[PDB]
Amino acid sequence: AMADMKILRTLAGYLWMRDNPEFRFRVIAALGFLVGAKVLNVQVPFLFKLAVDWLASATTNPTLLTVFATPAAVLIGYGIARTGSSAFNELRTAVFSKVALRTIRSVSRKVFSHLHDLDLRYHLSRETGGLNRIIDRGSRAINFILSAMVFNVVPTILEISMVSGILAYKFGAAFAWITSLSVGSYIVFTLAVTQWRTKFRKAMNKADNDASTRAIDSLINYETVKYFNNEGYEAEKYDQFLKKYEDAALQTQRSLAFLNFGQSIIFSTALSTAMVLCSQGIMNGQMTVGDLVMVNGLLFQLSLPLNFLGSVYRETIQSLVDMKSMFQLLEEKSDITNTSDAKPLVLKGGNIEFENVHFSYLPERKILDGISFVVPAGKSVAIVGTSGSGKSTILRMLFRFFDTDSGNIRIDGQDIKEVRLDSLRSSIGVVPQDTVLFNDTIFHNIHYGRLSATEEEVYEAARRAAIHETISNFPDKYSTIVGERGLKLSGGEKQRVALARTFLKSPAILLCDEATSALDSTTEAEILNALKALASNRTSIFIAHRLTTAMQCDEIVVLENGKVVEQGPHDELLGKSGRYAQLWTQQNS
Amino acid sequence: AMADMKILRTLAGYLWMRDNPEFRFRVIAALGFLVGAKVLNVQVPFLFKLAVDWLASATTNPTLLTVFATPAAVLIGYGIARTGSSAFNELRTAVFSKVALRTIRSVSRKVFSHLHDLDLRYHLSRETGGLNRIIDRGSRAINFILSAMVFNVVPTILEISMVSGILAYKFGAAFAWITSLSVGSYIVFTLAVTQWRTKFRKAMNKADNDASTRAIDSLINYETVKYFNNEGYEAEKYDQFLKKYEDAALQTQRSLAFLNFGQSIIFSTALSTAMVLCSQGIMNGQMTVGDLVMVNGLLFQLSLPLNFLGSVYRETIQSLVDMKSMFQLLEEKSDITNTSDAKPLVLKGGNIEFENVHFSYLPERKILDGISFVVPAGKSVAIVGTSGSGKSTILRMLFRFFDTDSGNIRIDGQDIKEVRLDSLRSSIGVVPQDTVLFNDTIFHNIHYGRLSATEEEVYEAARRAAIHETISNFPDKYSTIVGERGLKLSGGEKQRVALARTFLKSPAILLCDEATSALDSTTEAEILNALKALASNRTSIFIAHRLTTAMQCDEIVVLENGKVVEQGPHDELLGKSGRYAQLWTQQNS
Numbered sequence A, B: 001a002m003a004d005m006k007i008l009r010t011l012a013g014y015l016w017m018r019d020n021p022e023f024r025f026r027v028i029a030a031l032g033f034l035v036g037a038k039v040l041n042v043q044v045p046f047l048f049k050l051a052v053d054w055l056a057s058a059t060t061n062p063t064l065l066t067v068f069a070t071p072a073a074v075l076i077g078y079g080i081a082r083t084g085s086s087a088f089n090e091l092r093t094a095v096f097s098k099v100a101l102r103t104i105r106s107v108s109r110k111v112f113s114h115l116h117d118l119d120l121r122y123h124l125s126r127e128t129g130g131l132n133r134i135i136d137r138g139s140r141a142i143n144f145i146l147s148a149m150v151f152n153v154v155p156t157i158l159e160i161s162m163v164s165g166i167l168a169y170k171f172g173a174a175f176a177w178i179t180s181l182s183v184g185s186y187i188v189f190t191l192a193v194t195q196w197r198t199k200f201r202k203a204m205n206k207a208d209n210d211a212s213t214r215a216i217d218s219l220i221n222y223e224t225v226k227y228f229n230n231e232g233y234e235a236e237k238y239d240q241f242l243k244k245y246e247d248a249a250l251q252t253q254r255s256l257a258f259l260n261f262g263q264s265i266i267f268s269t270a271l272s273t274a275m276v277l278c279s280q281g282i283m284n285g286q287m288t289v290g291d292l293v294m295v296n297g298l299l300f301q302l303s304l305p306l307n308f309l310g311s312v313y314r315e316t317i318q319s320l321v322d323m324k325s326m327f328q329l330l331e332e333k334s335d336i337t338n339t340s341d342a343k344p345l346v347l348k349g350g351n352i353e354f355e356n357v358h359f360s361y362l363p364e365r366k367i368l369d370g371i372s373f374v375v376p377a378g379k380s381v382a383i384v385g386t387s388g389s390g391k392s393t394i395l396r397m398l399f400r401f402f403d404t405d406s407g408n409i410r411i412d413g414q415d416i417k418e419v420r421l422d423s424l425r426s427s428i429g430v431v432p433q434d435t436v437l438f439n440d441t442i443f444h445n446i447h448y449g450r451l452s453a454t455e456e457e458v459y460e461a462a463r464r465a466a467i468h469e470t471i472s473n474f475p476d477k478y479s480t481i482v483g484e485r486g487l488k489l490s491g492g493e494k495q496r497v498a499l500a501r502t503f504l505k506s507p508a509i510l511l512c513d514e515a516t517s518a519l520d521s522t523t524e525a526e527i528l529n530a531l532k533a534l535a536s537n538r539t540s541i542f543i544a545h546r547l548t549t550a551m552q553c554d555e556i557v558v559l560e561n562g563k564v565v566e567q568g569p570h571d572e573l574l575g576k577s578g579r580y581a582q583l584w585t586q587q588n589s
Ligand SMILES: Nc1ncnc2c1ncn2[C@@H]1O[C@H](COP(=O)(O)OP(=O)(O)O)[C@@H](O)[C@H]1O
Pocket: A124, A125, A361, A362, A367, A387, A388, A389, A390, A391, A392, A393, A394, B487, B488, B489, B490, B491, B492
């Protein structure tokens, strides 16, 4: 199909690079080795003919091409024929393997580079645990398929060419017709069975992927199932999915088998018809002069790839589907594309203004209806209010994760839409909604703030976050492995790692999502004071509905149902008897 | 080796079940089909002999076994020979495929059932993202290997048996010796190359697994890399790992190739030696009576599996290693094993006492040094203090996730060590440290409290958690997909889902890890009041260093560095000027 053509074109483009002529040299050498090996294979039965007819003569020598006396040397060379055939087949794989592995490396490189380019609207909801499975299966699929494609499929047509070349001796005058008819009928039957089996297999792969997703989700949420003693429930669900895959595979496997019977009988008759015509001519052309052996031989060397084609068909219908799935991954469109006239941003001072911004995560429901406020340079603002009002969304747009529906965003009198992403993102620092850590050292995960920083910068950074007091009690200094998702550490430790990451970068704009979420009063008061003198540039935004941590901020904004309701400093805001007054009089108690 | 023997024994035990004699019937039928097909294959060249010698006679008939006139019918039956060989080979796969898929289902069943049985000390730190990869690769490995094992390896020895049976005609009197020598030398060479390549491949698989782990960790922490603009860093690290795997594969692949040359030359000489001895006897025994054709034929049918053995060797050395890795997963020991005299627990009232408990997560560092307190039945306790004092550990032991080093745990005058796990775990309910949700509906994830509950119980449960107010604003009622880890919801929503899960179960013992972590003052005050009248049995434990949420609890305990320092009710505790007084006077401000 056209999709297969595009896949082949992309594969050929990735394989063939014009920078290095040494690659073309390798390809030409591999082709030469293939041609030599197949020529030797065709030569084998032809040279075996002289042994047979010489024995028939023994039962003079018209041909002078013979330089021997006893046919034993002929049989020695007959063995040497397959020896050399293997030898030339040997060197072909060695040359092609390097370029095959280079292609694998380049493809995996491109896929990994491309995946992080996509948007949160993909990676947040349409990331079903198993993109790793797709990449792993496809990467293994590519090497197998291209290794299969060159090593056995390509030489088969060339052997067909030589068996169609055997007509020069007046033998194959019809054998060419029979072989062409058999090949065409076999190809038609194979494609018909293949389309039918793809029709019956589309349900198989769909069922298979869901079971792995269920298993990976069960592994990820192991704590909950251990809490609620419901292991049998995931057990039964995985059983049902596996039974569905069982039925799908069993139905297909019997039908996949039937092709092997069809392939064998068609080509058995092809050899049978070759026997019949050879039997018809009782005259000397095709009786007892060896041509029966080559016809048994040469058309059987065409039957050598028959063993591959029937046997490897099970994975061909499976891996190629996974190939298209993984290649389909390299055609998605980045939702957030920078403007054509991309221009870097330079700020004399961080001033942020909203001009009636509207955003909806889904088109039907609009979370926020009108937001307009200004962030003075040299000061800071706090965002407090009831939950569910999208107050972490308001800081998910300044980083251009999503694009607003109808509104304007201004930083230092510059358009966020117009400015470059790299200048935008590297100038503003954030602490995430739920802290996530790498599977490496705590020192590496705290040094991630600026990858070119020094150890003393890291050590002084931990002093600002006041974690050396806990560090001195470490069992391993700056080397405790923190697990898969920072689980090994505590809540306060996980939250204090992210803050140190932000301070190490020391960005121009601060963006705090959770401050003092899981910290005691003494630590949080120290962090806030440590976050005022240092670690905070002249612009910073806090979203924290704890009242004591929004005391220090210059401006307080109240968000309810997406409308920015009440504004003002703390002293006036308490006397207004607004939502802020209700919230504060409760926490103060 | 012995490990291979144990793997084979386990595989045979899983495959062979004695409950159903129909399985034994299927196995016997498959063996009969195999024997018939191979007998037909051996018959092919033997019946082809009569065609050759009859033509030599044409160049009377001593044997009366012939019932034909023209050799065309002999050639028709000659084609029918491979037709029937394929036909019997056809039915063998159909019968064996069902039991193969049943074995796959049972093995995956057992692995999934066994994985959730292990402990947190495994699933929390030694779970490197990729257990799913191991299971997926092994499950695919089993079907391929056992499909290969029966279909081609087993018939090869049987063809060796018949080619050693051809001696009855005084032909193979030495051919048996040559074939046995060739087989033995080939096996010795194959095992030597295989052990060398396993030595060179142990580094390959080790390098391969690390790259996939890096990729999966990068995918999991996508938000952090997007925050910090360090995509090139993971790019370079994945490049380095892929280069290491590249070198490991390239070094092995050239050496893996060399075996194919060695296998071919040894068996080419075996056929060559068969030619030589046949050439020595110019007398009628082995000249121009067809035996050259069978010797070319019969020993080549032994060379039919040669094509498999060389070609499929690449995955045999790979999948079998993955087989052992996945089977090694079903031998780990559960760290927490219930006592032999397992007895269910029945509580008249929840009374919890600690008797000088000591626990260390790692042997070197002891987090807590002596904990002893009593939980009165009908009342509740609050655990407040500075972070890092293991206050979520103190509730990770009542659920018997780990075992204490030196101490006693008592519930209603019963030993936690002695009582049964299922009675223990199903009687106490907990809310997790970091909320984790399934990849299903919000209704399913809130109904997970009691899987046999009704919708009205779920709907009234959401009323207790006061989430219908947000539910009425849902875009889809009780059906919004919540993503991979509940990411699509907000923090307050994620925390309020877990609480509803706990209330739906309505356990005998309440165990709250984070209460009002990401909730405003108005919601938290409502939840606490909604958690006093209902949803709380007579025993409950709160760990929350927020002062306003520990006001209602009867008893307050202060934990610092693992020592339970200060105890007492709120009114007396404030006047003691302890750590609690310092913490409260700050939050109150
Ligand atoms: N990925 C998403 N898909 C659909 N709705 C979302 C998504 N992320 C957030 N929301 C909606 O936004 C509201 C709150 O947004 P957010 O700022 O993320 O949480 P919070 O307001 O607690 O900070 C919620 O009511 C939720 O329905």
